[PDB]
């Protein structure tokens, strides 16, 4: 699994927290053009396989934006980092004290989300607590008019160190499929910083390869999303010239 046996005791510490299946709670408070809503999510993460299983419920009634637009906002510490890359796993290294994750998400020709989250352990539970603010949306556009398909694409998200912040940054493009066959671009800008003052791992440039499947619970009457997601780190090669040459 294993996941204690690394020569680096800092790596060992972070990896230990994510051995096995870890329960997850997600809490989001949102306001988009004054449309207020809340989401609660539950499930588990198995970082050894890069695997996330989560069910989200809108606890205020009808979600006023399409569920796919919230996927990126609603725990990259469950990414599978290859053994030769484990020195570049910022997310696990910040645990259990945790990290702040902040984004601005620009929906092209529409409004923007600004998000601030804190991701940390509460006992055995990995908790993602989020505030989301959206402004300048078209009230009958693709987001507030619910014109997006209920599905999700696969991505390569590039991570860079942000050294003077002692953290990381990323910018990446998500396309949401529009029901007429077109696409709604959501351009993501992201930064993460540790919550503790302890040492963290600042990574070399690399990327996260993501894939997500959205489904519905056939017995659930509340507005909700079921998410099955896999995330794997990649983009750094090993030695020696090469192991397989």
Residue numbers in the entry: -8 to 65, 69 to 239
Article, verbatim:
Notably, methods such as RESOLFT (REversible Saturable OpticaL Fluorescence Transitions), nonlinear SIM (Structured Illumination Microscopy)5 or pcSOFI (photochromic Stochastic Optical Fluctuation Imaging)6 exploit reversibly switchable fluorescent proteins (RSFPs) that are able to repeatedly toggle between a fluorescent (‘on’) and a non-fluorescent (‘off’) state. In so-called “negative switching” green RSFPs, the on-to-off transition competes with fluorescence emission upon illumination by cyan light (~490 nm), while the off-to-on transition promptly responds to illumination by violet light (~405 nm). However, the development of RESOLFT nanoscopy in live cells necessitates RSFPs that switch efficiently even at low illumination power (to minimise photo-damage), display minimal residual fluorescence in the off state (to maximise contrast), and are highly resistant against switching fatigue (to sustain a large number of successive on-off switching cycles). It was found that variants engineered from fluorescent proteins of hydrozoan origin (jellyfishes), and notably from the well-known EGFP, could fulfil these requirements, giving rise to rsEGFP15 and rsEGFP216. To shed light on the switching mechanisms of rsFolder and rsEGFP2, we solved their crystallographic structures in both the on and off states.
Models were refined at 1.45 Å (on state) and 1.50 Å (off state) resolution for rsEGFP2, and at 1.50 Å (on state) and 2.35 Å (off state) resolution for rsFolder, respectively. The photophysical properties of rsFolder and rsEGFP2 are highly similar. As rsEGFP2, rsFolder is an efficient negative photoswitcher, both in purified form and in live cells. The two proteins display almost identical absorbance and fluorescence spectral properties. The pKa of the rsFolder chromophore (pKa = 5.5) is slightly lower than that of rsEGFP2 (pKa = 5.9). In rsEGFP2 and rsFolder, on the contrary, no such reorganisation of H-bonding networks is observed and the structural changes are restricted to the near environment of the chromophore phenolate. A similar situation is observed in rsEGFP2, where His149, playing the same role as Ser142 in Dronpa (distance to the chromophore phenolate: 2.7Å), finds Tyr146 as a surrogate H-bonding partner in the trans state of the chromophore.
